[PDB]
Design a protein around this ligand. Sequence first.
Ligand SMILES: [Zn+2]
Lengths: 58, 63, 44, 303
Amino acid sequence: MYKTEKVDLALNRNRGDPITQHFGFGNDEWPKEWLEKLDEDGLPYIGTYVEEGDPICA
Amino acid sequence: TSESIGRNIVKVVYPDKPTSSDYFQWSEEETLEFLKWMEKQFLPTQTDQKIARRKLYKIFPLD
Amino acid sequence: LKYICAECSSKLSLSRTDAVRCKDCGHRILLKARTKRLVQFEAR
Amino acid sequence: MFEVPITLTNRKFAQRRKLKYQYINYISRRFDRISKQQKKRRRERHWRSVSFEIWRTVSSQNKQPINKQKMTYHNFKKIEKIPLRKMEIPLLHCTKENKLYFQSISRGLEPLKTSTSEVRNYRTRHIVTLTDLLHLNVSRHNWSLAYKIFATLIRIPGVQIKSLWGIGVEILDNLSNSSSGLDFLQWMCQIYSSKSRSIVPPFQTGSRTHTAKFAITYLWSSLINCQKSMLIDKISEWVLTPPFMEDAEVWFIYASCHLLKADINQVIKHIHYVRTFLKICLDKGGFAVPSRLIENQLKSFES
Ligand SMILES: [Zn+2]
């Protein structure tokens, strides 16, 4: 079975607004286990096994 | 020319009148190249709401 | 070279605040591409 | 030779304000006697008032019945003689130019040189020229240039400006780009309506009691952006939004929104509505048509 989900973080922004949220990682301190699922862009590496609760996006 | 435009820029911070009346008698292009030199060389400036002013200023284009 | 153009197929990479578009086409739709990494499976 | 949109370069002007209001205190104190600290400066400067649509003034009636001479030469120099020496004490601490200023203003002479004329900084003088060119271009209908000036200006860290009516009418006549006069005004009210002096007369103000010019002008001018129509329930939706109760002018804005929406029992409710807000606009410092004229339009409606 295949399921396609759309992640769209322009969902809140009020039309051509300044952009608050950008795919990727910041320089604050965040888990690091995250890089097991996610590439540098904040998108998940293709092929990755993913079960409930895992990151699919950063 | 680069020179006279410069001498205008010095005229602005010369202590005595008339030279400031001299900036009075300058012309739209002088004022324009002035604001240019202002945004260029008064980045050599001195000394929540902050991001609110990044979006606030990003309300009107910086170009 | 993490990404691929969906229209012209040119392989290309991005950076921090970069033109989310093909540097050849100008098409604004990019497919991710994927890199040597360990995934483990049981042959059953 | 024009007002500068910067906080005035400091020290000597402030210590002169000291000498001035301190001597003022000693003279007026002994004067009330004869009629019988940052904070000292603060109380001192404190107890003192700080056919067309004319927002009329308060004319002459219900006021006093004169005075007859209080101050001969001998009597004045009586009041003056002592507070001048008390002044002799801290005059010894201030600077020689400052002391001279104290001597001359206390003789009654008025100083030749402005605060600007004796001021003495690169970045601020450059911002002065920037802002100036903004105001000039906005006067010159040069909305393109003026827009460049505005963007480059707001970029800068250096000074906040009350200058706000400058930008209200500025972006107003600009039409060019940037999140416009209304956006600026509602920003002014959103930032400066919460706990969150020299510079301030009424045309730029704080939101404890009336912020006047910019608010009422976006109000009316937005109702004229409905004159574009024949938006209203928007304008009075965000005139509905704010609590800053000392207005009434937004009560007449409100009732004007109901007269404009009244141009079937719905229209009735709008006419009863304007009938209500005209009196809850008799609440405060009155904006009055003969208002039997308002009602006469409302009977042309009652048709
Ligand atoms: Zn392409």
